[PDB]
Amino acid sequence: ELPEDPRWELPRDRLVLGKPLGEGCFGQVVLAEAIGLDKDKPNRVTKVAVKMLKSDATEKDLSDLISEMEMMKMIGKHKNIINLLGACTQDGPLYVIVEYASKGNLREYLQARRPPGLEEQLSSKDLVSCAYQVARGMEYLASKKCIHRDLAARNVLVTEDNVMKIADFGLARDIDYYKKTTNGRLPVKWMAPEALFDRIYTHQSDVWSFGVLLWEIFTLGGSPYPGVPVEELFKLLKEGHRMDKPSNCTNELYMMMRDCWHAVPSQRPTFKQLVEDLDRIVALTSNQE
Ligand SMILES: CN1CCN(c2ccc3[nH]c(-c4c(N)c5c(F)cccc5[nH]c4=O)nc3c2)CC1
Numbered sequence: 001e002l003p004e005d006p007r008w009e010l011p012r013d014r015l016v017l018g019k020p021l022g023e024g025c026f027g028q029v030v031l032a033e034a035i036g037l038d039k040d041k042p043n044r045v046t047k048v049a050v051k052m053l054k055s056d057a058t059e060k061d062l063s064d065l066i067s068e069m070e071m072m073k074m075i076g077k078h079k080n081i082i083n084l085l086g087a088c089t090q091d092g093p094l095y096v097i098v099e100y101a102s103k104g105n106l107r108e109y110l111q112a113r114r115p116p117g118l119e120e121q122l123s124s125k126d127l128v129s130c131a132y133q134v135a136r137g138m139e140y141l142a143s144k145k146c147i148h149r150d151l152a153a154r155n156v157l158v159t160e161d162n163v164m165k166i167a168d169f170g171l172a173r174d175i176d177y178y179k180k181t182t183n184g185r186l187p188v189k190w191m192a193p194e195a196l197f198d199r200i201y202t203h204q205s206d207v208w209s210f211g212v213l214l215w216e217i218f219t220l221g222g223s224p225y226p227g228v229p230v231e232e233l234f235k236l237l238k239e240g241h242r243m244d245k246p247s248n249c250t251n252e253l254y255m256m257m258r259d260c261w262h263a264v265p266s267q268r269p270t271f272k273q274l275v276e277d278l279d280r281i282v283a284l285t286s287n288q289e
Pocket of ligand 1: 021022029049082098099100101102103104105157167168
């Protein structure tokens, strides 16, 4: 049984469910319509995302979704993170109501806006702006002592207004290195060597992951290290190997990626330094190409 928090509780008759946005088997996300979410108007509908459990859910799977909601309540609001909007915790299945990003993840979005081969296209100032927002989201998360542990283009969602929002920042701590994603990608490729070989996740290991994220932006949703299996990736990290400079990527932004991949975690930039640099770079980057 669950206790009511009146700050966040939404009556169940105010949530009209819809088409599913994602799956697991670890839970499921659906598209929904929340009636009068805001204090005024109680007659306006907001399109939302509803996190819920599957039929084959256990007490562990349930405590995991509670902790996530609980984490989001503590962390607070930012324009560049997926915010918490409400919850249905009484007399039925637990529904954690979060922000809905109509354009999907940042990898899918970037891939769908690639140049023709072989209706909407992003300029140089556009790509750098995506990097700025994600570093803004991550810096707030860092200010609130949150360590993402899986910062990647896949876990950055995009709104109808082209705002970048960090997602799955509140997920349960609980990893199989040989496991691949839905898109058949190995998540170990976003991991800092200290986190991968010593299990030491810090704000510095998330900075490493931001470096893999930039490479994903300026390659327009490119796959890091294609064809490279798990065991061959460890050898690449031990030799001091680094990814190649994307084409249509400045010397300044590649120097940034490489700094993010500094072998020594203490020597890497902070998100507070990355927000500042990208703030300046956007202002100097051309919107004409
Ligand atoms: C063919 N395909 C159909 C579904 N397409 C799609 C489009 C937008 C989408 N937004 C989210 C979504 C979440 N999955 C989500 C989450 F998992 C945790 C927290 C917040 C979230 N907010 C969302 O808005 N899913 C989407 C799927 C992609 C293309």
